[PDB]
Amino acid sequence: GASKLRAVLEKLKLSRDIAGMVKGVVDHLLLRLKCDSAFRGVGLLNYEHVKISAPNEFDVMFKLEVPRIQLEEYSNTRAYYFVKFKKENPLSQFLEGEILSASKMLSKFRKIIKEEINDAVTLLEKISVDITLALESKSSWPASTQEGLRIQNWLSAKVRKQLRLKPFYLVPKHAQEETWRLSFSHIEKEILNNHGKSKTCCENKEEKCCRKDCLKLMKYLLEQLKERFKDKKHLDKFSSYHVKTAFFHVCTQNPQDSQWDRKDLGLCFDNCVTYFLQCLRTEKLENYFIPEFNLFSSNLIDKRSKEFLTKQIEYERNNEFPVFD
Amino acid sequence: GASKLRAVLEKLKLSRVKGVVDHLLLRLKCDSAFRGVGLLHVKISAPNEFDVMFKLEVPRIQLEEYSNTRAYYFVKFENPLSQFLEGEILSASKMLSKFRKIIKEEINDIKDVIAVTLLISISVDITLALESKSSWPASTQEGLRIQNWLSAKVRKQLRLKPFYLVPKHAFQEETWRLSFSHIEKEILNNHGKSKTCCENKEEKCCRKDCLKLMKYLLEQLKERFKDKKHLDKFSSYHVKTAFFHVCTQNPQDSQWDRKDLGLCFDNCVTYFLQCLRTEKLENYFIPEFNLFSSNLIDKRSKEFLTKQIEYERNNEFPVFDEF
Numbered sequence: 048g049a050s051k052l053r054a055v056l057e058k059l060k061l062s063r064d065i066a067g068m069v070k071g072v073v074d075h076l077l078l079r080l081k082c083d084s085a086f087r088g089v090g091l092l093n094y095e096h097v098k099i100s101a102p103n104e105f106d107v108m109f110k111l112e113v114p115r116i117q118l119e120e121y122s123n124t125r126a127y128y129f130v131k132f133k134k135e136n137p138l139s140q141f142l143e144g145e146i147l148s149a150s151k152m153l154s155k156f157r158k159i160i161k162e163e164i165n166d167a168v169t170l171l172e173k174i175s176v177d178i179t180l181a182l183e184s185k186s187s188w189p190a191s192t193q194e195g196l197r198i199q200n201w202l203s204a205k206v207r208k209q210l211r212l213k214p215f216y217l218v219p220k221h222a223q224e225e226t227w228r229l230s231f232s233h234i235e236k237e238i239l240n241n242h243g244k245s246k247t248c249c250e251n252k253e254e255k256c257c258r259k260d261c262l263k264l265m266k267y268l269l270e271q272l273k274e275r276f277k278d279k280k281h282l283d284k285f286s287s288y289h290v291k292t293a294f295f296h297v298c299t300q301n302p303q304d305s306q307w308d309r310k311d312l313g314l315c316f317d318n319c320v321t322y323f324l325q326c327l328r329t330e331k332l333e334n335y336f337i338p339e340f341n342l343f344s345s346n347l348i349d350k351r352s353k354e355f356l357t358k359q360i361e362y363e364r365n366n367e368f369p370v371f372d
Numbered sequence: 373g374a375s376k377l378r379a380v381l382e383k384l385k386l387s388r389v390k391g392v393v394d395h396l397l398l399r400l401k402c403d404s405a406f407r408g409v410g411l412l413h414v415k416i417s418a419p420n421e422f423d424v425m426f427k428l429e430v431p432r433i434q435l436e437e438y439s440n441t442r443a444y445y446f447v448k449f450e451n452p453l454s455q456f457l458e459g460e461i462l463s464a465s466k467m468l469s470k471f472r473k474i475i476k477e478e479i480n481d482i483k484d485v486i487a488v489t490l491l492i493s494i495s496v497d498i499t500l501a502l503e504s505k506s507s508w509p510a511s512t513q514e515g516l517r518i519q520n521w522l523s524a525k526v527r528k529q530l531r532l533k534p535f536y537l538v539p540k541h542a543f544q545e546e547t548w549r550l551s552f553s554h555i556e557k558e559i560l561n562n563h564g565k566s567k568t569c570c571e572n573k574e575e576k577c578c579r580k581d582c583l584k585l586m587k588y589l590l591e592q593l594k595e596r597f598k599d600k601k602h603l604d605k606f607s608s609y610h611v612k613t614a615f616f617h618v619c620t621q622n623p624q625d626s627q628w629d630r631k632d633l634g635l636c637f638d639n640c641v642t643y644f645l646q647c648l649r650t651e652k653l654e655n656y657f658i659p660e661f662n663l664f665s666s667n668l669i670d671k672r673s674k675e676f677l678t679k680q681i682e683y684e685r686n687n688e689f690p691v692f693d694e695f
């Protein structure tokens with residue numbers, strides 16, 4: 048009974064000329080940001096719609112390369128780090144000790160943005176834009192990612208070796224307000240747009256896979272229930288990031304394109320539901336890149352919250368997903 | 373059938389200058405005209421001979437095709453190469469002379485070391501190549517037909533990479549010729565339709581070994597008939613070009629199973645022979661350039677190579693063992 052899923056995927060495409068006009072404003076923001084000494088080498092990372100149900104909301108990431116870093120891990124959190132330096136730092140005014148202050152460099156970031164309005168941050172009638180700034184280190188990835196990104200049986204060890212030569216990024220997130228969180232935003236995009244074991248996956252009629260459709264249906268399912276139960280607040284800590292990482296673990300578990308054939312959209316999606324449910328019950332959802340970081344730990348999400356989402360998802364599947372209508 | 377063939381590949385594995393190049397890259401970078409200069413085995417039977425190409429990015433180039441040759445171009449344009457201008461043309465004649473001058477005076481500082489060929493105790497051949505980060509020229513539009521093999525997605529990615537121009541006489545002595553040897557390497561080392569080709573026992577393919585055997589067979593015939601000199605104009609580049617066309621014809625990894633090495637190599641030999649007889653071997657990247665036209669290679673030279681190759685294939689390739 049995948050015809051209901053196929054219909055949903057067609058309506059989600061309906062709500063997709065949606066348009067590129069924040070690329071004007073982001074271009075004008077990027078001009079005066081380079082005029083400052085601290086943000087000279089800042090360029091755009093990639094639109095990127097976090098919410099697949101709100102095409103009128105975008106998200107862009109601004110990257111600034113840092114020349115010389117020695118990273119310092121906060122406690123055993125393995126995802127949050129202190130950024131310490133090894134010429135003349137243009138971010139020397141953001142130094143609180145040996146630690147580049149996240150808060151300091153963010154404050155300057157919003158100031159110049161609030162100075163271009165008269166001509167992290169979210170910008171205004173029916174469109175919004177979420178802006179994030181990230182450090183770029185072209186160095187080797189930290190030791191916590193050594194066992195992550197298990198794509199060797201799927202996209203090959205050769206591709207994993209090439210992806211890990213690319214730079215990694217750090218975004219400002221509290222852990223304590225002096226920490227930076229690892230981010231591989233660029234890698235998840237590259238993998239999803241180059242997702243088959245076959246290099247010609249989805250390029251011909253004989254190799255049509257349903258990986259991308261399963262991810263979309265997964266994100267739509269969570270957003271729909273997040274708005275259905277928007278009052279209880281039990282679902283507020285659940286985001287499409289959790290759904291994406293679970294989908295990537297499923298791709299690792301099912302590496303052949305034979306296991307994602309478009310005919311089997313029903314079972315593929317159902318197996319994506321099931322793995323997500325299993326992570327909820329056992330309270331275990333490892334970061335795809337940082338395998339010892341548990342997104343579904345009791346420290347970050349309450350068990351009662353996961354039990355409510357499990358109950359609702361199981362209800363939806365048992366009744367042919369009325370959430371989609 | 374692959375018994376003798378695999379025994380030949382096992383010998384070629386057993387048979388497998390850094391400093392000299394590094395000391396040359398520094399004293400060359402000291403010159404203004406060659407400020408941006410960086411790094412980027414031609415023979416399988418001569419492992420005491422290496423091959424290296426030095427790249428130098430030229431910022432903004434305006435190419436002009438020389439008389440519908442599709443491969444040779446004049447390069448027109450704070451310019452560090454204005455010393456080598458002969459009007460508005462970057463004269464390859466003057467560019468390659470200043471190149472040899474710095475090297476010839478630098479191998480004086482290893483005290484015996486004698487485009488340019490170095491002799492050590494071992495031989496190294498150095499080539500100079502301008503790099504343009506622009507889009508590839510129009511003569512290349514229909515080349516690199518890898519869409520059914522390595523995917524159109526990959527073809528557009530490789531097409532975003534820079535191309536290179538090498539000083540080669542066309543004779544007009546200041547023309548530059550297109551070069552994509554960097555693309556050839558990436559295709560050869562990432563060669564399957566499946567990204568895990570040759571990464572497990574289930575997906576073992578015989579593409580790389582098929583090309584090695586074709587290069588070996590050519591290099592051996594060259595040594596065998598080196599006196600008569602009919603085979604001097606042939607080279608590994610012709611063999612590699614025919615191989616890439618066979619990869620385009622046979623895009624599935626199942627048509628290259630390691631079990632079928634005998635059939636695959638015989639098919640690779642057969643297509644190369646077809647290129648010889650019909651005198652047609654398109655450049656893989658510039659399809660309108662025929663490497664086997666009678667302008668470049670004598671037809672009797674191709675008929676001599678055909679006769680020799682056809683004898684070897686009919687007699688289980690005896691030339692693989694004689695030397």
Ligand SMILES: O=C(O)CCc1nn2c3ccccc3n(CC(=O)O)c2nc1=O
Pocket residue numbers: 126228229230231232286288289334337340342
């Ligand atoms: O991938 C990106 O760059 C942004 C998306 C994203 N990454 N991310 C984490 C990455 C590492 C560790 C914890 C992380 N958390 C914790 C959370 O879910 O709050 C988190 N949430 C996110 O939304």
Ligand SMILES: O=C(O)CCc1nn2c3ccccc3n(CC(=O)O)c2nc1=O
Pocket residue numbers: 443549550551552553607609655661663668
């Ligand atoms: O750098 C590269 O592209 C590979 C090396 C290489 N390229 N190349 C040619 C490229 C275009 C036209 C003719 C070409 N010929 C033979 C010839 O001049 O007829 C040739 N021999 C070579 O060894």
Ligand SMILES: [Zn+2]
Pocket residue numbers: 242243248249254255256257258
């Ligand atoms: Zn696909």
Ligand SMILES: [Zn+2]
Pocket residue numbers: 563564569570575576577578579
């Ligand atoms: Zn292979």
